[PDB]
C-alpha cells in the first residue's frame, strides 16, 4: 500500500508501555514487524496473515503485536528495556513476496530523561595554509555534548540544503566512552573551492536536528528543558 | 527455507573496479532470493529478486545476481563501482513459505581513485572565538588509515569521503580535537601511520 508508520521518531523512559501503528491501504493478507539493528539485519519480531492471525518471529520476547484491522497491525513494547533501542520496519506482502516496507520508526529508550542533553554546536573556519596550499577550503562542524544518540547533521549555503562536499561521521563518538550514559559527539566536513569561502556574501550553517523531550515530559532541573531542536553554528566567507 | 549467509559487515571496492557483494542460502529447494539497498538516512529499496524465472536477474543500475544452485549462490555484482554505490546490501530468501528473512548485511565502502595524493595537517579555528580548534587530516589516499585515540582526552574520527561535485574531486580526511592545553595539530595523528611527506604548515 502506501504502508505508513507511526512515530516516525520517539525516545522514551525505561518502563513505559509503547505502541507503534502500521496502517496499509492496499489490504494484503500479510503484515509483519521487523527490527533493525547495526551487524544484525532484519529481525523478524511477529507476523499476521489475517485479523485472526499472530505468529512468533525470532526475537518476539518483550513485545505484544495485535491485528485490528485488515489495514492495521500494532506493535506493542510491553515495558521498554535499553536494548529495545532500534529502528523498526512495518512491511505488508502480496501472495508472491511482494513486500512493501514502511519507512521506518527510530526509537530510543533511555533508562534516565535526566540525562538528555541537546548540542553545542561550533563551526571551524578553514585554514590559510589549506587555502594557499589546494586552493580548496574545509569548513568543519562539531556537535558535542548530545544525548541520546539521535540526531541529523545538515549543512546550508545561502540558505539551501547542500550535498555536495559533504561528508559527516555515520557514528558519533562517545564522550566518555566508560560509562553506559555518556554524551556524544559528531563531525562534518564541507569542502568548497577556496574562491567561494572567499567572498563574504556567502554564508554557512552547520543545522543538527537533536530529538529529546516533548512539551509533556515533566523537567526538574535548572538547566533549559532538552526538547527536541535544531541546534545551528554559523560562519560567513572573508577575503582575508 | 532456513538461513542465509552474507560474508564481511564491511568491505571495500576500489572507484571503477568490479562490485561483488557475496550471498549464500541453505534450503533444499531453490528459494526466491532478494537483495535490498539502504543507503544512510533511509529505508531499504529492493535492487532485484530471483523468482525463478531467469537465473540471470538484472536489476536497476547495472546491478546484476546469478542464481547458482549448485554452489548455493546469488551474489550481487555491478561492473564498476562509483562514489554513489556506498550503502548497505541486504541478501534475502524466502521462508517457511510465509516471509522474508534477512541476511546481516554488509556496508560497501568505496575507495576513490586519488591519483595526486597531497596528504596534511591543518588547524582549523572556531568562527566565534580563535582559542577553541580542531585538527583536519586531510588527502591522503587509500594506503593510509587512521587509528583511534591513544589518550582519552583526545578525539579523532574515522576517516571520511567527500565528493566535492563542483571540481569532481573527492577527498579523505578525520577530524581530532581535545580540550586540553597540552594539545597540539603535529601531535594529533602520532597514534596514526601517517605518509612520510604528509605537509606540517607552521
Known amino acids: 500500500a502506501d504502508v505508513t508508520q507511526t512515530p516516525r521518531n520517539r525516545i522514551t523512559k525505561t518502563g513505559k508501555r509503547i505502541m507503534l501503528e502500521c496502517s496499509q491501504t492496499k489490504g494484503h493478507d500479510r503484515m509483519y514487524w521487523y527490527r533493525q539493528d547495526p551487524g544484525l539485519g532484519l529481525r523478524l519480531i511477529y507476523y499476521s496473515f489475517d485479523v485472526k492471525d499472530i505468529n512468533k518471529g525470532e526475537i518476539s520476547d518483550g513485545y505484544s503485536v495485535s491485528r485490528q484491522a485488515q489495514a492495521k497491525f500494532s506493535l506493542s513494547l510491553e515495558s521498554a528495556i535499553p536494548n529495545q533501542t532500534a529502528l523498526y520496519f512495518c512491511?505488508?506482502?502480496?501472495?508472491?513476496?511482494?513486500?512493501?516496507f514502511g519507512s521506518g520508526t527510530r526509537l530510543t529508550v533511555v533508562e534516565d530523561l535526566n540525562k538528555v542533553s541537546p548540542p553545542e554546536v561550533a563551526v571551524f573556519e578553514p585554514s590559510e595554509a589549506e587555502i594557499s596550499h589546494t586552493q580548496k577550503a574545509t569548513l568543519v562542524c562539531l556537535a558535542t555534548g548530545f544525548y541520546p544518540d539521535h540526531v541529523e547533521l545538515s549543512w546550508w549555503v545561502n540558505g539551501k540544503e547542500v550535498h555536495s562536499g559533504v561528508c559527516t561521521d555515520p557514528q558519533p563518538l562517545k564522550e566518555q566512552p566508560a560509562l553506559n550514559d555518556s554524551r556524544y559527539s559528531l563531525s562534518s566536513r564541507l569542502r568548497v573551492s577556496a574562491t567561494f569561502w572567499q567572498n563574504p556574501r556567502n554564508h554557512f550553517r552547520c543545522q543538527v536536528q537533536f530529538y529529546g523531550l516533548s512539551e509533556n515530559d515533566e523537567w526538574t532541573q535548572d538547566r533549559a528543558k532538552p526538547v527536541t531542536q535544531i541546534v545551528s553554528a554559523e560562519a560567513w566567507g572573508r577575503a582575508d | 527455507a532456513q538461513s542465509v549467509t552474507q560474508l564481511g559487515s564491511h568491505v571495500s571496492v576500489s572507484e571503477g573496479a568490479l562490485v561483488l557483494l557475496r550471498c549464500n542460502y541453505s534450503s533444499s529447494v531453490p528459494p526466491y532470493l532478494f537483495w535490498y539497498v539502504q543507503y544512510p538516512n533511509q529505508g531499504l529499496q529492493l535492487l532485484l529478486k530471483?523468482?525463478?524465472?531467469?537465473?540471470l536477474v538484472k536489476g536497476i543500475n547495472g546491478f546484476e545476481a546469478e542464481f547458482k544452485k549448485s554452489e548455493t549462490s546469488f551474489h550481487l555484482t555491478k561492473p564498476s563501482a562509483h562514489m554513489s554505490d556506498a550503502a548497505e546490501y541486504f541478501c534475502a530468501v524466502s521462508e517457511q513459505d510465509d516471509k522474508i528473512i534477512f541476511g546481516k548485511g554488509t556496508r560497501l565502502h568505496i575507495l576513490p581513485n586519488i591519483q595526486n595524493p597531497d596528504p596534511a595537517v591543518y588547524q582549523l579555528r572556531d568562527s566565534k572565538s580563535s582559542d577553541k580548534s580542531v585538527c583536519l587530516f586531510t588527502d591522503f589516499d587509500s594506503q593510509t588509515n587512521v587509528s583511534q585515540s591513544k589518550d582519552s582526552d583526545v578525539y579523532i574520527t574515522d576517516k571520511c569521503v567527500l565528493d566535492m561535485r563542483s571540481m569532481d574531486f573527492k577527498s579523505n580526511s578525520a577530524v581530532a580535537w581535545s580540550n586540553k592545553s597540552d594539545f597540539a595539530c603535529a601531535n594529533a595523528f602520532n597514534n596514526s601511520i601517517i605518509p612520510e611527506d604528509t605537509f606540517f604548515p607552521s
Open positions: 530471483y523468482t525463478s524465472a531467469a537465473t
Open positions: 512491511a505488508t506482502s502480496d501472495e508472491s513476496y511482494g513486500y512493501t
